[PDB]
From a paper:
The human CD46 receptor, also known as membrane cofactor protein (MCP), is present on all nucleated cells. CD46 acts as a key regulator in the classical and alternative complement activation cascades of the innate immune system by serving as a cofactor for the factor I - mediated cleavage of C3b and C4b. In addition to its role in complement activation and regulation of the adaptive immune response, CD46 is used as a cellular receptor by several viruses and bacteria. The four SCRs in CD46 constitute the bulk of its extracellular region.
Residue numbers in the entry:
A (entry chain B), B (entry chain B), C (entry chain B): 1 to 252
D (entry chain A), E (entry chain A), F (entry chain A): 129 to 325
Amino acid sequence: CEEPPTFEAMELIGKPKPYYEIGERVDYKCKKGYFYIPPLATHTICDRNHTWLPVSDDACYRETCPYIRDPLNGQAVPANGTYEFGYQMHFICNEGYYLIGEEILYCELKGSVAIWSGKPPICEKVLCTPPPKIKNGKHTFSEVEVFEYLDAVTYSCDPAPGPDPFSLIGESTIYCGDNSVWSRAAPECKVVKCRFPVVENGKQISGFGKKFYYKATVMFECDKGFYLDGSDTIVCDSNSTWDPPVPKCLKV
Amino acid sequence: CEEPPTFEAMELIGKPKPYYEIGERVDYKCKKGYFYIPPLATHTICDRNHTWLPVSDDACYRETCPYIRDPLNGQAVPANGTYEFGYQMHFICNEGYYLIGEEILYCELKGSVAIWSGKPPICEKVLCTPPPKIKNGKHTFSEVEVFEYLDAVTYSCDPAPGPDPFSLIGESTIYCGDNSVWSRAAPECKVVKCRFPVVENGKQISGFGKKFYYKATVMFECDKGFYLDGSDTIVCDSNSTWDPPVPKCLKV
Amino acid sequence: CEEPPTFEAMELIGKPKPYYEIGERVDYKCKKGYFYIPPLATHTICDRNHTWLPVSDDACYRETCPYIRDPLNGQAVPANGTYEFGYQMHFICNEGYYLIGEEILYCELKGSVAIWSGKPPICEKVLCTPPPKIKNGKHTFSEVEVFEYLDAVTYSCDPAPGPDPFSLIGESTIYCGDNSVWSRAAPECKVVKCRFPVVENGKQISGFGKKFYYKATVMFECDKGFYLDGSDTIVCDSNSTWDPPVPKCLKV
Amino acid sequence: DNINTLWTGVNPTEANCQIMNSSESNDCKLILTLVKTGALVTAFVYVIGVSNNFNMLTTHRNINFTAELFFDSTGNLLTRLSSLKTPLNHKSGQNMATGAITNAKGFMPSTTAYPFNDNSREKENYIYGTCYYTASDRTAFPIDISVMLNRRAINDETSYCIRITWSWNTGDAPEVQTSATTLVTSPFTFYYIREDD
Amino acid sequence: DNINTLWTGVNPTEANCQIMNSSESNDCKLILTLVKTGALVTAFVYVIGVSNNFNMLTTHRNINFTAELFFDSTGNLLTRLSSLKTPLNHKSGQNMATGAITNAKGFMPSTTAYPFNDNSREKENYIYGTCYYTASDRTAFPIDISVMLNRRAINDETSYCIRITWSWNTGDAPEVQTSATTLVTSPFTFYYIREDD
Amino acid sequence: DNINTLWTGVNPTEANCQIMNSSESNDCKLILTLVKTGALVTAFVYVIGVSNNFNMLTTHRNINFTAELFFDSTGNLLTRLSSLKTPLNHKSGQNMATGAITNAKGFMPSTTAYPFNDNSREKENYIYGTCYYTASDRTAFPIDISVMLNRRAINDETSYCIRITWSWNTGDAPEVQTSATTLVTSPFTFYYIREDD
Ligand SMILES: *[C@@H]1O[C@H](CO)[C@@H](O[C@@H]2O[C@H](CO)[C@@H](O)[C@H](O)[C@H]2NC(C)=O)[C@H](O)[C@H]1NC(C)=O
Ligand SMILES: *[C@@H]1O[C@H](CO)[C@@H](O[C@@H]2O[C@H](CO)[C@@H](O)[C@H](O)[C@H]2NC(C)=O)[C@H](O)[C@H]1NC(C)=O
Ligand SMILES: *[C@@H]1O[C@H](CO)[C@@H](O[C@@H]2O[C@H](CO)[C@@H](O)[C@H](O)[C@H]2NC(C)=O)[C@H](O)[C@H]1NC(C)=O
Ligand SMILES: *[C@@H]1O[C@H](CO)[C@@H](O[C@@H]2O[C@H](CO)[C@@H](O)[C@H](O)[C@H]2NC(C)=O)[C@H](O)[C@H]1NC(C)=O
Ligand SMILES: *[C@@H]1O[C@H](CO)[C@@H](O[C@@H]2O[C@H](CO)[C@@H](O)[C@H](O)[C@H]2NC(C)=O)[C@H](O)[C@H]1NC(C)=O
Ligand SMILES: *[C@@H]1O[C@H](CO)[C@@H](O[C@@H]2O[C@H](CO)[C@@H](O)[C@H](O)[C@H]2NC(C)=O)[C@H](O)[C@H]1NC(C)=O
């Protein structure tokens, strides 16, 4: 009667024979992670026409793990779709919350009972230490010891240490991020003063003054019969240098 | 036969009828926190004269909690009198001992067995940290780290910082109290020097000298035909002021 | 039949009689820490010749405690020889390992079952804190926080604080010992300078120079008709003194 | 023979027990099986929750509930006093028998072994054990059991008493309002010396 | 009478059970004794290790092994499906009987008390207990037991099921490669309501 | 029938057991009940203190006491060797019977299941459990039980042995000199395969 039919839900009991006689009976059982529901048959007998009688694995139903309730300020996402045997459960915490426990739980089978790998995780509130102390500058909420999610602090430089004031380089306001770390790096309070820009055979058109500090914009225009070599617009950088460098008007 | 009799120790089984027939039987059971002792009956039958037969709650005896042995360096006081159901046990520690655990225990009933709310407390020895450090003064047992009950320390001011010495304001000796706190506030070592008291049309009678310090007593007597306005006796206070203020002799 | 025979492995059941009749039976049982193995008899009957029948304690075998596996980086030594009842087990850790737990375990009997006093000890790796900080001198591995077994550190004095250099007194190299303590005491870096040795009626023969420091060796020879009073060889000690003291050449 | 068993039956359609004071009507199914084993009785006891209030005890941290069983001189259950409102009877397949009870006094705990109001023998009247609760996450929650045989009588009728107390005191409750379904305790088996027939 | 017992016998010469998936042939000796006690069954179960691989489970920290027992409509053991490969029979001194089994259905766990695929009654199908392992140092190691009665069927033949799971999860393993000899669990006794004859 | 039970009786007037070595005469009341349950024996055991020294064991932190029971070839108790000084007999209401013992060998633990001096089967000879002590404050104190069946023989007469060891090792003692009254352990039930009649 040839090899017995193969099924996805049920497996054959014992080794299969290459040939079977008329009247021979073969039995099937639900696989690991499957259970039987009556009345559908799980066995077949070879008929007089040397063929197996109709049989289906419709009686075997999938074993499922218990329903995981979404963790407080987080979520339980079934990566494979359902709670079925051999599947996994992923955990992601909400904005401003960090995971404590197992990020991944696997649906296991221990003594024909479907049970998860362990206890679900907890999503704890995100808290961060005070922001970094900067030289020649101070931030808001200086006496606050513990900072929670989205708590922002604004930095400001100390008063002028003479004729030139302290320049603030970078973002002044920084907040507590999702990974318990401050959103951006702490700014710098440095005395930034650029040299007087003078172009030969060229005249200054914008940004007039005797002193040039951080982010100072100056524009230049060449005289009659002279072409500009570089950029007309120049900005003073954090390291007291003109970026792009001071242009030059060359003769045609 | 009217409503059945009401008792303090036993309660009627089932709802009471407004009227009963001759021969009708009513049963009683010992209330919560009461147990039955034989042979006295807990039931009554209505006789031919339409009255209930004599019955008493004398068979029901009060359920009692176990005997609490007095805690070491403390005492167990039954506030309500006995160990009976619904009563409480209060705990007070002896002089120089503090309570660790439950100050109050209630006599509860769990599965018809009388049991206390919890384990009795422990009376631990009273220990206090070193006394406060005072400016311009020092105390005895300066190197002692831990102080036990009734341990006294005497304060004394440092030597004279010139022509006027340091004055001690308040009690010099302080001891470790029952609440693990020092009996009185630490004294002060301040330079106290009062102004020379001079009364117009009056003569000084007591406390002669050129310098007046803390708690210095001076008395005054008015001249012929002059009355005293205030008090004759004046004492120099802690803030270098005469209390009551310097008197004045006014003309009659 | 007189007193029944006494055995080392088995004891008589009941009080012994001074005299026994013909046919009287006496029974024995294996002592505490002994068990019976068949078929040898543990009882004797008095024969017609007023004597006890042959009986031996060969059936009683000694109760033994479980085999203790040698601890990792240590050893289990049976002080009394075997695992028999009433014996003890001693534990010694290997070179560079210290004992954690019970050094001695006793073979006890609890409910006719031979069991040891407790769990065997663990031999933990020997670790020691940094070596002592010396004045005017420094050691190798100065930034190393934790030192393991046999880790050696070499001491060296700081450069000369003028015309005379720092002298090293004692062993320069110290290692981590077996008792988590440094093998030898930390050396000294002291300025050692001895006085110029001059002997009356005597001439210097060895160790020529203008300055004498730590461990400096000087030899002396007396003039014609003069005998040496003391030792010819003199060594400068750690306290800037000649040991033995400077010799003297006395006239014959 | 069926006469060796005195039981409540197997899973009764309606609740046969009023286990708690707060309940007005029957709150749960008390499964009690008493089997005569020589001079002893094999006592098999467990509860199946019916009412919403009794099933909601799994949402609390500190809980204790007692099943009081009272019997007369002949060894018959006093339903009006006991927690169990249906009288016990012999085995009839998977249900209770209809007819007379053969030696009901025989299933009762001995007054000689477990006395009434004898303070010098108080300790002998107690039996302690453990049963388990199968939680929603399929983990077993241990529940302490306190069994008192005879000891305390409530009236002139109570000649034989059996008190079973299920209790737990934990930091975390077995279930939550959304996970809780039915309060079912695992079967507990205890042994006691039986009174004469 | 001998008919009140349905057992495996006492210490069979050869291994009668294939308890683990990794094994090709029989790995251990399953000692199972089912005694009829009124409307209940006194179930006595323990294992004696035979194979090297099964005895070596004492060297591991986290271990779990299940003894699956499947029975037909008449209450006869299905050896081809069950962990136990030798059919159960009556008492014959210290061994099994040869002849017919008197009321095999009577030793089976009740479908009325322990249903199949009834999720609203799931909790009733479980029994939990503890057995001990006598270690090489003569100390007792506690092992958790999970017993599932009926609940899950594997095919059209399985009418009665008994599943016994021995498990432990500790920081230290019961034995080491040099101390381990034989994996023997202490006898565990559990109680269940029996199906009708 | 009364022949299925082999017991000490119910609460004997005088002490029938000398449980400890230090005692000169009988120190406590050993309540032992052996009931034939098919191929097994329902063993019910607990102690009631009599002597001042035995009752004072509740004032100590580390305590262990063994009740040794020795039996001959026919299954009769050897009083001169055993801790129990009164021989066991059948049920006679709440006391022991006077006449002959029907199949005394039947109540004995099997030599086939529990061998003597077989080191390769040593683990099979042990049974472990837990009983409780009702303290003066009405709280249950857990006591560990170590049961050894057969295994060790003391002489040529001892054919069947039963050893029961009650023990505890805690930081706090169950009672104090003023609170201690009587040392009473809760009834402990264990199961073993019985020897043939
Ligand atoms: C063997 O095969 C034959 C041919 O298909 C089967 O006979 C047919 O059966 C169907 C269903 O009853 C009828 O509709 C046809 O009229 C039959 N045809 C012929 C030609 O007989 C037959 O049933 C099979 N036999 C067995 C024993 O399985
Ligand atoms: C279930 O889903 C998981 C996660 O998507 C699958 O595991 C991933 O498989 C891929 C391909 O083999 C790997 O690249 C990843 O590393 C795996 N991730 C994790 C977290 O395991 C898994 O194969 C799926 N299984 C079934 C049975 O559907
Ligand atoms: C009904 O009440 C009457 C009147 O009190 C009771 O009769 C009295 O009983 C006492 C006690 O035995 C005697 O001392 C009197 O001589 C009786 N007096 C009369 C006038 O009969 C009577 O016992 C009560 N009956 C019932 C059935 O309770
Ligand atoms: C037992 O005694 C206690 C303590 O004296 C009583 O409780 C006090 O009751 C008064 C009046 O209601 C309150 O003002 C106090 O706050 C209570 N104190 C405490 C500590 O509970 C209690 O009512 C008495 N009970 C009985 C049954 O006698
Ligand atoms: C009492 O003692 C006598 C003397 O030793 C025993 O008789 C001897 O027994 C041995 C062993 O059988 C023989 O070799 C000798 O020939 C015997 N000698 C005599 C003089 O009889 C005798 O057996 C003992 N009797 C009992 C009852 O123990
Ligand atoms: C077993 O050996 C131990 C250790 O050698 C013996 O105990 C020592 O006994 C001597 C003499 O009494 C004492 O001086 C020591 O203090 C003991 N040491 C220890 C560690 O106990 C012991 O007596 C021997 N016992 C037997 C039964 O052989």
